[PDB]
């Protein structure tokens, strides 16, 4: 069914119930894959960002005002809004650098070849691409869930776990 | 080295961080020896954690002490005199390097046909036991440094029948 | 084997019990390796049984114990906790089997036209140091069991000026 995209794994297979990777063009599928990779990268970072500041609030490690009322990371919109604005601005600037340099079709290769490590063979690479994609998918789901849950009952993740009797700490 | 005992589903060849990239057969043989020995030790260690929870020997390790008073987990490395621990260590070493009270020919059965399958099974069990021994060590040591810190009481938390 | 290194004038070839007849050169290599290692360790012993009698380092070996109070000799063992002893034993082994922290090439000199004379000096010193350690252990242990035995209450009896 698929056209050679490195994705697709044993748990399910080629997951495409709605029929999008048959009604698209050769360039459209490339853009879809890029969209996937990028969303995942951001998400993964955002999940780690939700976890660590919130925990540092739970452990009294940043003072008694860090995420003041509850401890939710969605509370930065109340305490320090301009900091969040400037951070989104810096992200936007570096991503404008991306949009300028990278050309249509790439938009994912940061040319970070020597600055980091990489698998030496070729099969392992295919595996690492599949991994990046899978971690990104799981992170997308996790971020959506965290945001929805916190907007439902204003309460941090670890505390929502502690209450309601889902952990043992 | 993509075809050597240890390749089993789901993960075909689990060398993600490129360790078998540029190595000769000697180094991979050393790695396999370390893996097999580690696995065997881990399996014996897990069995050792479980069994003293419902049975203790009838002798008296160390001058006093007695085998039925010693704590069960990460402790008992500080409740047995150091000389006895050193002697046990060196005896295990004698069995390890010299291979002494550990090579009896009645210990190498004729695995008619099934040799490779049984080697693969032994390696996989070693892997599982290595992870299990890590979990047991973490739970015990953490709940020893600060009683609690996990909520889960008891040392072998998982088999509640032993009431421990 | 009556021409290999290790023959001096008092007792030229020492082998009364015939422990080196019919052996292959591989073994005699292993025997010489054991002799050299034991000799070096015995020298370091006969030097570590003396130094603490007038100079204790100062640090804390374990969380509560101080190397200012632990008695010297076959008594310090049961003071340092068994985990610390083990953590040492394994590091000494790391230096002994994998040859780490002990193979720095600038420690191996070029004895030139003396490499057959300094090796013999090393071996003979080791032979003497082994017997010295035997005597020190005898005195130490015999008095640690029954205090006052042999009458010479001190440790390094032969060096009275130290005030053992
Ligand atoms: C004096 C006794 C003695 C001797 C001479 C040997 C000899 C050997 N062992 Mg060995 N071993 C022993 C006791 C001994 N063992 C005991 C009691 C255990 C625990 C079951 C093991 C577990 C063991 C494993 C798992 C492996 C060896 C390996 C080896 C080989 C070389 C590596 C080595 O020892 O350097 C030691 C070098 C080190 C760097 C030591 C590592 C220290 C670890 C990481 C942390 C130490 C934790 C702490 C100090 C000990 C707590 C446990 C203790 C209280 C029981 C060699 C044949 C290795 C092998 O076959 O080839 C690779 C190997 O993989 N041994
Ligand atoms: C923006 C998000 C996004 C995008 C663009 C893609 C894109 C892709 N995924 Mg995908 N995926 C995602 C998120 C995403 N994924 C998440 C979060 C998961 C975890 C559940 C997965 C799990 C997954 C599997 C298991 C598989 C794919 C596959 C694919 C490829 C073929 C499907 C296709 O044509 O596009 C699909 C996506 C779109 C056409 C656009 C996004 C979908 C709509 C617009 C979102 C609707 C709202 C949503 C339901 C809210 C929740 C394609 C490159 C398949 C593959 O590798 O093909 C070779 C495959 O087997 N994905
Ligand atoms: C210190 C312990 C130890 C040691 C020395 C090894 C050593 C080895 N493992 Mg291994 N492994 C371990 C723990 C260990 N493993 C654990 C805990 C797991 C469970 C996650 C695994 C799961 C595992 C798999 C799934 C595979 C290896 C493989 C290998 C071999 C090649 C990979 C490599 O290390 O390079 C090598 C002999 C690979 C192999 O069989 O190489 C042929 C392989 O496919 N290992
Ligand atoms: C031969 C031989 C001899 C003479 C000894 C002598 C001794 N062993 Mg011993 N031991 C031996 C073989 C031997 N062992 C063997 C083959 C093993 C199996 C590995 C052990 C395992 C062992 C343990 C586990 C302990 C002793 C202990 C002791 C000491 C008892 C306490 C005391 O002061 O007396 C004593 C010095 C005890 C000790 O060191 O207490 C100070 C102790 O706890 N031994
Ligand atoms: C600490 C001591 C020690 C250790 C580490 C081992 C270790 C081992 N023994 Mg063992 N064994 C020991 C003492 C020991 N043995 C003694 C004292 C006896 C005599 C009763 C035996 C009799 C024995 C037999 C008969 C067999 C083993 C076997 C084995 C291996 C499984 C493993 C290498 C098996 C190989 C096997 O068939 N052992
Ligand atoms: C760890 C103990 C140990 C070991 C393994 C050896 C091993 C050896 N010694 Mg030796 N030796 C030792 C302690 C030891 N010695 C002590 C304590 C002394 C002092 C009395 C000597 C004094 C000694 C002499 C004087 C001679 C040996 C010789 C030898 C070698 C042949 C004799 C033999 O053991 O067979 C052999 C390599 C002989 C040798 O080197 O022949 C080439 C030899 O002539 N040894
Ligand atoms: C994890 C630690 C470790 C490891 C892996 C090794 C590894 C090794 N040592 Mg070694 N050693 C160590 C610690 C270690 N050493 C320490 C702490 C000392 C004291 C400073 C020594 C002193 C020592 C000597 C003197 C000799 C070795 C020898 C050896 C080799 C063979 C040992 C053997 O057959 O098993 C051990 C086998 C035994 C039968 C143990 C005997 C223990 C005696 C009889 C009494 C022990 C009482 C205890 C309280 C091997 C390379 C030997 C060698 O290189 O050539 C053969 C050798 O002659 N070692
Ligand atoms: C505590 C373990 C230990 C042991 C048994 C030895 C043993 C030895 N070292 Mg050594 N060494 C050690 C730790 C140790 N070293 C550490 C921690 C360092 C870093 C400072 C060194 C740095 C060192 C050098 C620079 C040299 C030795 C050398 C030697 C050998 C004489 C001998 C085999 C010599 C060979 C030599 O030249 N060692
Ligand atoms: C820099 C350079 O030069 O080279 C670089 C190149 C390159 C490639 C960048 C490099 C790399 C790789 C990197 C950085 C890889 C990073 C990968 C990363 C960071 C992957 C995160 C996954 C997180 C997940 C899946 C979250 C799960 C979370 C899940 C599934 C949850 O359930 C969360 C949860 O909330 C729910 C939803 C409900 C809550 O009630 C309960 C909890 C809280 C449990 C290197 C190695 O750095 C070198
Ligand atoms: C330093 C220190 C410690 C220590 C220690 C250590 C490691 C001490 C080590 C002691 C050690 C290593 C003692 C070896 C003796 C070997 C001997 C005597 C060999 C004799 C061999 C003899 C006498 C002769 C043999 C033969 O002549 C025969 C019989 C016939 C001939 O044909 C052949 C030859 C010539 C070979 C403690 C205790 C751990 C704690 C303390 O706090 C600090």
Author numbering:
A (entry chain 5): 37 to 205
B (entry chain 6): 36 to 199
C (entry chain 7): 23 to 186
Could you pull the original sentences from the published paper?
Based on the analysis of the FCP bands by mass spectrometry and specific sequences obtained via transcriptome sequencing of C. meneghiniana and genomic sequence of C. cryptica, we assigned three FCP sequences to the local map of FCPII-G/H1/H2 adjacent to CP47/D2/PsbX/PsbH as Cc-Lhcx6_1, Cm-Lhcf7 and Cc-Lhcf7-like protein, respectively. The B-C loop of FCPII-G is short and shifted towards its helix-A on the lumenal surface, leaving a large space to accommodate PsbX. Helix C of FCPII-G interacts closely with PsbX by a strong hydrogen bond and extensive hydrophobic interactions. We assigned 11 Chls a and 3 carotenoid sites in Cm-FCPII-G. One Dtx is identified at the 303 site of FCPII-G in the current structure, which shares the same location and orientation as Ddx303 in Cg-FCPII-D. Cm-FCPII-H1/H2 was identified as a heterodimer, despite of 80% sequence identity between them. FCPII-H1/H2 dimer is assembled in a “head-to-head” manner by two adjacent helices C, which resembles the Pt-Lhcf4 dimer. The binding of the FCPII-H dimer to the PSII core is dominated by the association of FCPII-H1 with FCPII-G in their loop regions with help of several crucial residues and pigments. Four carotenoids are assigned in each of FCPII-H1 and FCPII-H2, they are Fx 301/302 and Ddx 303/305. Thus FCPII-G and FCPII-H are both inner FCP antennae strongly associated with the PSII core and probably mediate EET from outside FCPs, and may also play photoprotection roles through the Ddx-Dtx cycle under high light conditions.
